[PDB]
Amino acid sequence: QFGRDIADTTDAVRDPQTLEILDITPCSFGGVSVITPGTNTSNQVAVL
């Protein structure tokens, strides 16, 4: 009924009403970095 990944998290599931398999891919994420000249020069920043 359920599949699992190395972390024991759910990898895929079988839909309980219609028996098809759905992959579960966690929603996009990532670190956010701010690129900035010192604030003694400018308050403009770029975001990575």
Partner: peptide, 23 residues
């Protein structure tokens, strides 16, 4: 360096790169 490659590496360097290999 070998000018014919997509990355100008030498013959020997290519050999080295071909030997060393969530949510």
């Amino acid at each position: 360096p070998d000018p014919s490659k997509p990355s100008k590496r030498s013959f020997i360097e290519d050999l080295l790169f071909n030997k060393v290999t969530k949510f």
